[PDB]
From a paper:
[name] is a relatively small, inert, non-toxic globular protein that readily diffuses throughout cells and can be genetically encoded allowing non-invasive fluorescence visualization of target cells or proteins in live and fixed samples. [name] is a small, folded protein and the entirety of the β-barrel structure is required for chromophore formation and fluorescence. Recently, we applied Cellular High-throughput Encapsulation, Solubilisation and Screening (CHESS)-based directed evolution to superfolder [name] (sfGFP) and identified a [name] variant, termed ultra-stable [name] (usGFP), with superior stability when subjected to SDS and high temperatures.
Numbering used by the authors:
A (entry chain B): 2 to 64, 68 to 237
B (entry chain A): 1 to 64, 68 to 238
The structure:
């Protein structure tokens, strides 16, 4: 795609999220940069409305898969970069086991030289003293796989994965992610064969930042394409 | 699928000790940190305990614990590195810097109590006086790579090959070919794998509180390249 050429260097990123969970509103703004050749992202997020009413780890997946490292042999299967520069809509339902649900809608696109992710998030049916609204999640993150398949009828993709959030008592809070992406433009996009992305995330704090915030390093790498060749062999 | 796998289900402390000699320039490095194999994650800080490193930090990354790789459930029977524990394995490499010299390394990786220890000797020869390595012309960063692995039935271990791409300060790339062998230290049985690869990603940084010559490293290593029937069914 012509879109993949936009990612050959380090690209600045802007993230803007407006959220409402059980009526608790908040906004998050993030900035940083992405290096898709190595599949690497670094960002700092601030809650601009004061205190975040949910744990930061619950927002990581919502807060730019166009920065995934796609191996040379799998370039034809990178939908995210192929939709650029006009971009794509990413929508999810995230179901927290035994608790509430987030519904998200994001637009990911270039504005000038910057890759912007603008998100609206609505959360409902959370327990006021559950793991989420009770802030019982550890400030850390696990490695996951994002499973991707084409959705020809929407000219896009679907994905599924299950996030594991460590809870302060030693338990694990599961969050099922149901995802769809569709291009914003009408130009042609690449629809992939089935594959997955391996993800790793590291969360930290800036010691000179007084606002409620999260520093994030993330790696995302594509794998799992069965070429006819090795299916033969 | 091995007993050794059980030693890696949580966070394991790591100690790394390296003695090096590159064209007669001697040095030592000590590293400490921890590994979380469930997530394929390593966090370490290394100090050059002899003062200044005579080679670029990036050239030592690969030498300075693949037992911390995340193997997917369906590939756990191919995890040689964990299966050799706790007695451990010897890891040897020849690393050829294209158009420059060579490192030869020998390391023992094993548990000493609750700590996973990597103790290494490195000898470097034939480096060019004008070159990217002794000239310190390499950027302080690292790229993502694939480590290719195959069984070595004759030595009851494995062999590996990969090509590291080091960014050079003028925009070129300095290649480093890695040839690797691993063999178990103990007698116990080990898992000999089908061909596969490890996908690696690394971030180099500095600790603002540390005034010694040092490198902070975060790394992710995940096994791949062996498919499973449920994934293939729907392709
Ligand atoms: Cl250096």
């Amino acid at each position: 795609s012509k879109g993949e050429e936009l990612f050959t260097g380090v690209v600045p990123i802007l993230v803007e999220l407006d959220g409402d969970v059980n009526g608790h509103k908040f906004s998050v703004r993030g900035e940083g940069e992405g290096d898709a050749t190595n599949g690497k992202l670094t960002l700092k997020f601030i809650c601009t409305t004061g205190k975040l009413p949910v744990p930061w780890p619950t927002l990581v997946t919502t807060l730019v898969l166009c920065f995934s490292r796609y191996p040379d042999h799998m370039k034809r299967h990178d939908f995210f970069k192929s939709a650029m520069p006009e971009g794509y809509v990413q929508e999810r339902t995230i179901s927290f086991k035994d608790d509430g649900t987030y519904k998200t809608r994001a637009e990911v696109k270039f504005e000038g030289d910057t890759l912007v992710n603008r998100i609206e998030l609505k959360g409902i049916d959370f327990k006021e003293d559950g793991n989420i609204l009770g802030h019982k999640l550890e400030y850390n993150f696990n490695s996951h796989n994002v499973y991707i398949t084409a959705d020809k009828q929407k000219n896009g993709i679907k994905a599924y994965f299950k996030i594991r959030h460590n809870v302060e008592d030693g338990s694990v809070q599961l969050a099922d992610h149901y995802q769809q992406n569709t291009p914003i433009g009408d130009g042609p996009v690449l629809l992939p064969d089935n594959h997955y992305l391996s993800t790793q995330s590291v969360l930290s704090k800036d010691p000179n930042e007084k606002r409620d915030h999260m520093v994030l390093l993330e790696f995302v790498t594509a794998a799992g394409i069965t070429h006819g060749m090795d299916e033969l062999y």
